[PDB]
Symmetry: none
Subunit: 165 residues, 8 copies
């Protein structure tokens, strides 16, 4: 149950993340997905290590700042991670989520259209998070509030934003 | 405090409402507001009388069906009462309600825009209800669920249905 | 269920009742039943309207004085309304109520005589109230305390006021 | 404090009261006051003796039926004792009690008239009881219920039985 | 239940007892039992009457001194009432009470001898009280404390005052 | 606080008391006070030792019959120990106690006569017990019950057994 | 039950113990067990007597310092009383207690070894106390705390002081 | 806050730990500290990873065996990890812990000697645990029970195992 971290390590990871931050600030709309995606990899490891570090420290206290930087790296990187449900309209955003949920769950549309946005979004988001190795939350889209609504997609689409089907 | 109803009266009002119902079933998308609106007047009176009749009976019990019909007339007439916030888009529906609330409350837009849809709607609706002498509820609009959202109009407009201002 | 009152209306009724009051203060022991009785009619309508008004206001509050005059008009008019149990003696007052109760309830005398004055009175009173469209209470008679006694008419008539049968 | 009764005594009194009972059953509406009144005398003595007897026995128990007959004799004799408030009408019965209370208490009429019948009666009754050496209760009158009313004589006289003053 | 006393009576009995007191002060060791005993009769009657008078007054209060004298007469007369258990020795006093209790209860001696003095005395005393129509208490004897002892007569006799049997 | 007994001891004292018992049975009314009194001495020591033995055993239990013989020796010896208040009458028994209490306490008679027998007896008995090295209880006298009475000697003497002073 | 002490006695015992104290102060590490042991004998007797003296006094109070010296003698003598479990090592101290407990209880070693030191110690100590007629407590050994441990002898010997068996 | 693990990973770590177990079973009392210590390094990393794996899984469940092996590796490796307080005697074990605690805390001996073994032990153990990156518990020493004693080191050393200072 109990584990300790190799000593050349907190600092190895502190300056390893320091220069991730440096590197992430460099990104803009045309660094390749090839770049960005390994930029995530790095972030992800450091995120892990931090969780170790935290619990170690917490455990060590009982025997009686990196994350601050990660917090920032996230904020920069958040902006360059794009899913296929990143759309130009409220309306296509919804379809994206619909079709994507159908894709993931393997459900017919008729059934997915009955599902509340809330499931559909968190089903779809967890999926892509897993897949990008980056947590992708609702406030990473401009239609955040839309994606939080507790109503079936059909109702949202017809009663909230006058769509067909 | 106590009052009695004139006796040639319940039936006078039963068959008076019977032929209202008859008449209301006749309405369609082109009877004039001039027609419809007196069709409401009548309904309104019968609604009043019924409240008397009810309270009289209730009082009489303690000394020890028309409404069913009204319920129907309502359902029919509900469909022919149009407000100026009856719109073809989700988007204009929202503007209508905004502009109308500004009009009623005399608030600037900037402030109205900060208000939750919910207030804005029931403020506006009560207003027009009073004005048409007919109760006008959210489910008298195709954008019912929209009108129920507990979010500022600004948020709805930008995050729920990508509008400008 | 919900109804609204026509707007030229509260005031139409306020000054309608104001001059009822004027008119009722003119009555005295020799205005005809013909006069008085229409005087009640008017009072009755205004009493109804008030009940609408009250409930409208109460309802309107939730979306967030006439009766005072009625109260007076009642007080004045109370004094000029006569039932057939208005009698010159305590004794005939009791008979009047007995006979009338028998009439209303269809009971034999023998049974009515066993009834407590209290029922008998409020049975009879409610009846005539209904009938005159005016509430007729016990203190509209000079034998009020008598009409309040919780004793069978037999007992009242023999033990309280030495009558035969 | 302690006293004993003379031994030829309980039985002397048992058969003394036995023949009182015999004698009292003979009375009817025309035995003279002269007769009846001695009939009370006898009853009174036997009532006393009984109270001694009772307390002696009770006392004697601690060192470890006549009254039944008296109870009857009372019942018979109760019916033949007359006060000056024994009247033919409810109405004079009330006056009788009024006037008598004024006499006993020395109050003005105006004040007595404000008193509740109940006091007035039990004031008057106790008085005459004392005076006739016989307990005189309300059900010794035909207007018993009347004498029990908890209402001022004024109210009773005007509202209950339409009298003047 | 309720009885009244004849009016020429309290005073008739006040001065009737006043001259009893007078007469009782006259007694000394040689007035005959014939004198003394009627002196008790009188006392006894006055004692009775007083109990009436008391209860009458007490009852009369609720409708809102002789005894003092008796108290004295008692004290004087107490001293002249002799029982057959009035003895010159502690020892014979005990026998007297034994033999007398055997007489009254009809018990054999052997059993009486086992009884506690206390019973034996209050049995015997009540008896003679009843018989003399005067209350005869322990402190009417010089051996009061003896008569109060809660010990069998056998024990008293042998262990308290070295008697035989 | 804690002590142990020398081992050649329980038995040394068991047969030492066995032959005391033998010796005490020999006593009769004419063994000298010189004999008897050393017979007490012995008994007293054995009594002591027993108290040790008892408490030792009791203590020893917690770390987890002689007296029966003493009980008998007492019973025999009790009968040969005589105080100066051993008298032939109830009456002289009392004086004995009186004079003896005066002697011990140094009080005047007038004061001692006021004292309750109970004090006077236990004052006097403790004294002689101390003095004879033998506990002398009330039931060692034929007037036991007398000596237990809770009354002043004066009262006992005059009211219980007709003495002078 | 009650016993008295012979009067030439408290002082006989006070100076008897006074010169015991003198004598005990003389002891050192080479007075023979022969000396010391009779020194205990004496102490023991005086301890006894004291218990008598105490209870006599306590008893005598109810009829309304030697021990201080014994307290001291104990403290001196305590230091010269040796058991066979008085050892040079923690290790042999344990064995001594083990073997001794086996001897006393007649248990096999295997079972004794499982017993908690606490029992074993207070079993063994009470035994030798009884046998030396001196209370022998844990703080009469240099390994007090060891003797107090609530652990089986096996555990103590192996885990607390690296012994074999 | 949320992180994901790289997918070629759980199995990379499962067989990585599988062959650690193989290797650890090889150790015996003569594999160098150089060997053993890197054996711990490995174990430590796998312990870390596991904590990640666990939390990921636990987190993933909410969106709705390696450790078993580590448990074993620990048990084997536990036996080959030695501290400087691993001694041949109870006695030196104590010193070792004392001196070590002085070293860690920088306290004088005099004060350390007053500290309860319990603190001293868990202070010293946490230290070396941290320093070996292996949890080192009391039952990794043959004097477990000793190390658990709630007594100052001075008392333990003098009263429990007859040491000097």
């Amino acid at each position: 149950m109990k584990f300790f971290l190799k000593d050349g390590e907190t600092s190895r990871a502190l300056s390893r993340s320091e220069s991730l931050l440096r590197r992430v600030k460099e990104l803009g709309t045309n660094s390749q997905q090839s770049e960005i995606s390994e930029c995530v990899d790095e972030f992800n490891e450091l995120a892990s290590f931090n969780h170790l570090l935290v619990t170690v420290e917490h455990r060590e206290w009982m025997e009686q700042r990196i994350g601050e930087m990660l917090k920032e790296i996230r904020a920069f990187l958040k902006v360059r991670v794009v899913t296929p449900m990143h759309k130009e309209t409220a309306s296509d955003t919804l379809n994206a989520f619909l079709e994507e949920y159908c894709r993931i769950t393997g459900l017919a549309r008729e059934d997915a259209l009955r599902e509340k946005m809330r499931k559909v979004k968190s089903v779809v988001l967890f999926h892509h998070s897993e897949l990008l190795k980056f947590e992708v939350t609702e406030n990473m889209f401009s239609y955040t509030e839309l994606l939080k609504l507790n109503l079936s997609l059909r109702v949202i689409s017809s009663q909230i934003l006058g769509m067909a089907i």
